Design a binder for these strands. Structure first.
Lengths: 88, 129, 218
RNA sequence: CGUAAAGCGCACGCAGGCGGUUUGUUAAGUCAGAUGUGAAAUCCCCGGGCUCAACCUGGGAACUGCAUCUGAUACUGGCAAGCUUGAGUCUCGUAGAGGGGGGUAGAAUUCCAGGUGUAGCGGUGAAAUGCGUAGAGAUCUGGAGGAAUACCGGUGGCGAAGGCGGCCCCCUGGACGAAGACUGACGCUCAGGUGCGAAAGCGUGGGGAGCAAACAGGAUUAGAUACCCUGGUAGUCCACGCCGUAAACGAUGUCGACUUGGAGGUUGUGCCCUUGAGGCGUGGCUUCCGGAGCUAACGCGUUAAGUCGACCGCCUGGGGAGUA
């Protein structure tokens, strides 16, 4: 569930500072971390429809954040996508 | 979800009368206070307080001629889903001219009557019969 | 102005919000009435009575609960007024055009009883009129002398007697009710908050009304 | 658009529609004035002329519009900079038949193998078919399996909806709460589209106790292609795919704001005494009764069908026909 420790590493790696936990930049990484994490649990089991709806939400969540962040400051947008491997 | 707080103001007043509350508070905004002055200067409300620093709490003291509500009718027209604008000399009279049509003009908000004597039209906000 | 001890406010948890202006929370989940705003009430409404009483108006005192009905009985029969302590006969006022006929029957029998026919047929049916006299007795006893329409309805309880209040309200007549936490004041004109069903409560009440009505013919 | 025709079964979500609040800014939409033009006729207004009128006819108004120019800057739009009451993230916890996968426990039914023991057993309104002296049923011991989880159990809980129930483990979704920290409008809805979606049914391979369409026999019956009884296949159970429909129903779209009360249930949490199964408050979900009001009425009623705002679906007499 993105163990407390995992977040404590992510926040320090993306936000303006360590106390930051709300910034758009950080939030995206958290979702992606979770998304990548469920891949295994979903490439396997291939049936947990209830769980997948949970996943599907965070996919939507993520996109909306980026679209917001793209129109705001393409700079931070280009870096994050590059530092986080996405935009198929 | 909270698209037009202007309609919200009216409703909180309409519902306020039904419960016969003394005053109905609401999250004030520049535009709303403008309307409040029109009403008070007209006589549909008494003495709005604009208390607020970053949380504008505009509480509207209500008028009661008797154990009957003063505001006999309040309906909004230019809604967010549909704005309405009328030429100067094409404004419509409210209750055969004994109500008011709060209209926003190039000179700000005023009563429909004020608009005619001032000779300018604008966005009609709402009717208060 | 607390004349006597207990009149402060009572009757329930399942109150009536219509009288939210007159409340205080008590240590039983029961309500306590703000008699403070009531002191002006009974003071003021009494003046209304005094004025109308001098107008040679009529004051009708209704009581129920079987407990305080006797107390009310003394109230009307103390100055000159009329009272109704038993079951308020539905519609005596709005339908007085016919209840008038019932009154006449009593008067005749009232004569037929103390001095009139009592043995003409047989004691068994002579008894019939007597027990019938009792029926009209508890109903139109203290009202027989009115013969018209009253002009003021002083009512003890608004719960049991909402029936008459609405009827009186339906006519061009003012009413005075000692409403309680679970009473609807909206059917009353000159409301009187406080207790209604307390036995001693009416004793304080009526006598206060009794004096005001006694002098009010000035 | 609760019951008359009318809420997609539920959901995510691009275009599209709409969008909190502060200030400045620009002047697009909007407004004022002027101008160019908006053919004449016709209509309208006031006149005039044919004996009046119809009719002809003078001047005006109008031509509801469009383009340009100059001012106005409230409201909406574009831009820039913020704010935090919307939304979202984190920390510590809580309840739960939330979902998928792997094991597992006991009762019972059926069948098989024996022991004991003897004329019924079973079934029904009665009865018959049927099982039985090759020895049943009943009862005892052992074994084989398949499916479902008594009691707890609660208009109790969880889930978008369909749904979901013994116990243990693994992987995992969501909801809600205390206290603050943080991001800074990042929203609401949503045609097309994608996904999920009871039972039945379909395909490939397993499994097959009980139950049971079809089917058979026996009754009932005027008939009985049924209702009842004795048996019984597909199916129902597992795996992977398809189907996409339900009176998929609070017959009530989603989201947000405002508007008297009462009794309950359930899950958090601060405080007074835990001084004694408690008292005082504040939140989430849910049950019932009813005020105003609403409504055709029944009824709904702070979980609204009340008062309003945003967006989407849908209805337009019945039958024909949700059919060709």
């Amino acid at each position: 569930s993105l163990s407390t420790e995992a977040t404590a590493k992510i926040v320090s790696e993306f936000g303006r500072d360590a106390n930051d936990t709300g910034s758009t930049e950080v939030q995206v990484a958290l979702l992606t971390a979770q998304i990548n994490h469920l891949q295994g649990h979903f490439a396997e089991h291939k049936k947990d429809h209830h769980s997948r709806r949970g996943l599907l939400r965070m996919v939507s969540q993520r996109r909306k954040l980026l679209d917001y962040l793209k129109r705001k400051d393409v700079a931070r947008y280009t870096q994050l996508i590059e530092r986080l491997g996405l935009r198929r | 979800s909270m698209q037009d707080p202007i309609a919200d103001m009216l409703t909180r007043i309409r519902n306020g009368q039904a419960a016969n509350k003394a005053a109905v508070t609401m999250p004030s905004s520049k535009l709303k206070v403008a309307i409040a002055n029109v009403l008070k200067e007209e006589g549909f409300i008494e003495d709005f307080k604009v208390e607020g620093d970053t949380k504008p709490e505009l509480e509207l003291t209500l008028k009661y001629f008797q154990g009957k509500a003063v505001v006999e009718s309040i309906q909004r027209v230019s809604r967010p889903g549909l704005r309405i604008y009328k030429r100067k000399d094409e404004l419509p009279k409210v209750m055969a001219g004994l109500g008011i049509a709060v209209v926003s003009t190039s000179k700000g908000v005023m009563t429909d009557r004020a608009a005619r004597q001032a000779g300018l039209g604008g966005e009609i906000i709402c009717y208060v019969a | 102005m607390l004349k006597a001890g207990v009149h402060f406010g009572h009757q329930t948890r399942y109150w009536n919000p219509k009288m939210k202006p007159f409340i205080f929370g008590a240590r039983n989940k029961v309500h306590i009435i703000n008699l403070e705003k009531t002191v002006p009430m009974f003071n003021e409404a009494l003046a209304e009575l005094n004025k109308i009483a001098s107008r040679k108006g009529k004051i009708l005192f209704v009581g129920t609960k079987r407990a305080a009905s006797e107390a009310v009985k003394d109230a009307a029969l103390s100055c000159d007024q009329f009272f109704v302590n038993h079951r308020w006969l539905g519609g005596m006022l709005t339908n007085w055009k016919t209840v008038r006929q019932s009154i006449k029957r009593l008067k005749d029998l009232e004569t037929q009883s103390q001095d009139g026919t009592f043995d003409k047929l047989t004691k068994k049916e002579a008894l019939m009129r007597t027990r019938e006299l009792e029926k009209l007795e508890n109903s139109l006893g203290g009202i027989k002398d009115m013969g018209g329409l009253p002009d003021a309805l002083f009512v003890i309880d608004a719960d049991h007697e909402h029936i008459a209040i609405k009827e009186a309200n339906n006519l061009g007549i003012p009413v005075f009710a000692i409403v309680d936490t679970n009473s609807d004041p909206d059917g009353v004109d000159f409301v009187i908050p406080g207790n209604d069903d307390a036995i001693r409560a009416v004793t304080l009440y009526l006598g206060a009304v009794a004096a005001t009505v006694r002098e009010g013919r000035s």
